[PDB]
């Protein structure tokens with residue numbers, strides 16, 4: 001999967017005209033504040049994303065982050081109609097650092 | 109006046125003279141009281157043949173640090189912060205009966221620090237432990253695996 005994430009960091013703004021009309025730059029995600037969103041129902045105990053890619057920052061303070069991830073989630077398998085069965089496997093994503101009082105999660 | 113400057117000031121104050129290799133007690137004779145609790149997320153596997161048990165748990169730990177204290181009135185009523193756990197002293201809790209895994213917590217998430225010194229740290233962990241398996245009444249058996 002690609003875990004697309006977007007938020008506003010007001011401290012990462014700039015006036016484009018002072019910087020040769022640049023509208024966005026890439027900053028290393030390791031060097032900026034990140035919302036620690038991960039998959040809780042993973043099996044094998046892997047939570048984070050695979051690579052920690054770069055983040056695209058806009059001149060107005062908007063952050064767009066698109067890191068890749070290999071996830072091994074656990075799901076209930078229904079065997080009643082095997083091999084004509086359909087499975088319903090869920091993936092739950094949460095902030096392991098911040099609760100609802102500090103960050104809100106919203107579906108794009 | 110925004111909370112961000114106040115938190116930055118608080119952080120610069122807390123870790124000015126902080127040593128993370130030092131047991132956080134004012135008096136040498138004092139004992140660090142660590143409240144320890146487990147929370148099982150799932151029972152990944154019970155390996156009867158290899159006599160091993162894989163679990164996914166949250167290791168809840170709580171103690172007091174006498175150097176990480178402040179008055180919220182002087183920092184815009186900031187009562188608690190989240191900090192990386194690798195910046196502070198932590199207890200060295202290890203699983204004795206480890207088998208085919210890690211002894212200690214390896215994830216090192218962020219710790220919740222309150223203004224009275226309380227530190228709350230709840231990293232996740234996947235443990236593979238040893239437990240003798242009794243199969244007298246298989247498949248009606250009841251196993252008793254310890255940690």
Ligand SMILES: *[C@@H]1O[C@H](CO)[C@@H](O)[C@H](O)[C@H]1NC(C)=O
Nearest residue numbers: 133134135136137138139174
């Ligand atoms: C530490 O506690 C002991 C009693 O257990 C006391 O005799 C000693 O004076 C204390 N030291 C300090 C520096 O408070």
Ligand SMILES: *[C@@H]1O[C@H](CO)[C@@H](O)[C@H](O)[C@H]1NC(C)=O
Nearest residue numbers: 180181183184185186187188
């Ligand atoms: C300060 O923070 C506490 C805890 O968040 C809150 O209950 C209180 O209303 C805030 N304001 C004052 C003046 O204490």
Ligand SMILES: *[C@@H]1O[C@H](CO)[C@@H](O)[C@H](O)[C@H]1NC(C)=O
Nearest residue numbers: 239240250251252253254255
């Ligand atoms: C499970 O094993 C532990 C360790 O030997 C023992 O203390 C406990 O009483 C046992 N419980 C049962 C129900 O057998």
Ligand SMILES: [Ca+2]
Nearest residue numbers: 153154155156
């Ligand atoms: Ca098994």
